[PDB]
């Protein structure tokens, strides 16, 4: 403080003062209610409010938003992946169709036609012209006895061996090689005591064991 | 009024005009040109320096992480329904395993055991009630060789109508209801040496058309 300039004392000391001997009030808490002065009405223009602004709280988070999309997208991925076109031509009868053709159904029809000609060979008279008429004139035979009965009978057997090839390459079947037994005695009683066809007929079902057992046989698969 | 005599020089005016700029070109390098710094002498302190900082580092990069979580997690959710291993799913004839037990394979064996009893009934002694009526055989043997009757043959047909119910319970595609014709003439030629027995045998394959035609809901038509 300079006396030559007459500096003036600011009001900073009155604010920093700690003691106080000027207040002459009998009470500042009980009298505050007498005038109806409560903090409730002051809390409206004095109490703080609620301020909260977040960008992730309102805006959608692309991070978690991706996990919510794959939820149904992935669940439907393998679901629709199982269905490609919407049709099953195999019908559980020719799975080889996917890697072949599936003649099992079609060829099944041509077989019913030729399978009958075997016994109907006598009902169908030969009317087509033959080219062996001049070859018989050289031998000239007069004794032409009838001898047709076992030739077409045994023919029904080889007719199945030649068909085992087109079917052998069908695909991979593992039905039942152990069941081949229950099917054996099944034909034994079907035969009679006199002529037993099961003796030579067994060789026909036995060959089926190879085509079916084909499920696993690298020993003869080169 | 004449300050051109050489009065004192006031400094208040020196502050008004105290700006200068020897360099007027746009390039400010002319200021350092006065030093003549060389690149070689400066390359000596060219050790550490020349670098940058990543901006995405401060930002989180786990956004796509939430998408990869449900990516494979949900992809397997539906896969568990079908099965990852898949042991004997169809095997070519096990499609009923999902809507049945698969008696077509096993039950097929019990049929070979009873299907033979039909003809074997003559090879073994019957157990019909009434041993007195057989007094003719107990008194003496008279003609007891092989003999196929028709009263026992018709029983082979009544056994196929009672077994179709256990199989019809499953129901399957008609496969080829149009092929039923190509199979008819195939049996007509199978016999041609007198009275064709296929005449009555047709009723047997005819019932098969109903089991296979089952492919469509019977209520849709009736």
């Amino acid at each position: 403080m300079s006396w030559l300039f007459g500096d003036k004392t600011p009001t900073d000391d009155a604010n920093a003062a700690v003691g106080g001997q000027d207040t002459t009030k009998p009470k500042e808490l009980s009298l505050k209610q007498s005038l109806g002065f409560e903090p409730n009405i002051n809390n409206i223009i004095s109490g703080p409010g609620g301020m909260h602004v977040d960008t992730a709280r309102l805006h959608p988070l692309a991070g978690l938003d991706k996990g919510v999309e794959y939820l149904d997208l992935e669940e439907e991925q393998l679901s629709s992946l199982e269905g490609s076109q919407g049709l099953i031509p195999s019908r559980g009868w020719t799975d080889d169709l996917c890697y072949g053709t599936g003649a099992v159904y079609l060829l099944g029809l041509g077989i019913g036609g030729f399978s009958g000609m075997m016994q109907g060979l006598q009902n169908i008279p030969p009317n087509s012209p033959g080219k062996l008429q001049l070859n018989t004139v050289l031998n000239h035979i007069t004794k032409r006895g009838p001898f047709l009965g076992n030739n077409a009978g045994i023919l029904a057997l080889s007719y199945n061996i030649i068909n085992s090839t087109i079917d052998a390459l069908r695909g991979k079947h593992d039905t039942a090689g152990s069941i081949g037994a229950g099917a054996l005695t099944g034909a034994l009683f079907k035969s009679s005591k006199g002529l037993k066809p099961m003796g030579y007929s067994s060789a026909m079902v036995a060959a089926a064991c190879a085509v079916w057992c084909s499920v696993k046989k690298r020993l003869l698969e080169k | 009024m004449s300050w051109l005599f050489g009065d004192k020089t006031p400094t208040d005016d020196a502050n008004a005009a105290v700006g200068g700029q020897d360099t007027t070109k746009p390039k400010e390098l002319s200021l350092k040109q006065s030093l003549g710094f060389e690149p070689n002498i400066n390359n000596i302190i060219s050790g550490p320096g020349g670098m940058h900082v990543d901006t995405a580092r401060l930002h989180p990069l786990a956004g796509l992480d939430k998408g990869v979580e449900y990516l494979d997690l949900e992809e397997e959710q539906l896969s568990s329904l079908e099965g990852s291993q898949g042991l004997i799913p169809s095997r070519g004839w096990t499609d009923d395993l999902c809507y049945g037990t698969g008696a077509v394979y096993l039950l097929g064996l019990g049929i070979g055991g009873f299907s033979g009893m039909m003809q074997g009934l003559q090879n073994i002694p019957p157990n019909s009630p009434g041993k007195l009526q057989l007094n003719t055989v107990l008194n003496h043997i008279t003609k007891r060789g092989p003999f196929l009757g028709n009263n026992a043959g018709i029983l082979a047909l009544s056994y196929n109508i009672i077994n179709s119910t256990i199989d019809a319970l499953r129901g399957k595609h008609d496969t080829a209801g149009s092929i039923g014709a190509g199979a008819l003439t195939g049996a007509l030629f199978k016999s041609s040496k007198g009275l064709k027995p296929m005449g009555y045998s047709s009723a047997m394959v005819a019932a098969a058309c109903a089991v296979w035609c089952s492919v469509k809901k019977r209520l849709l038509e009736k």
Binding site: L64, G67, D72, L73, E76, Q77, S79, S80, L81, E82, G83, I88, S90, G92 | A62, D65, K66, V68, E69, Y70, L71, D72, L73, P89, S90, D95, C98
Partner: peptide
């Protein structure tokens, strides 16, 4: 064969993409 779904929600297939795991929700 047993392979027939029921009712499909539009079409949105997707080839195999990514193959790792970190968090779980």
């Amino acid at each position: 064969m047993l392979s027939l779904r029921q009712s499909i929600r539009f079409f949105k297939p997707a080839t195999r993409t990514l193959c790792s795991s970190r968090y779980l929700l």
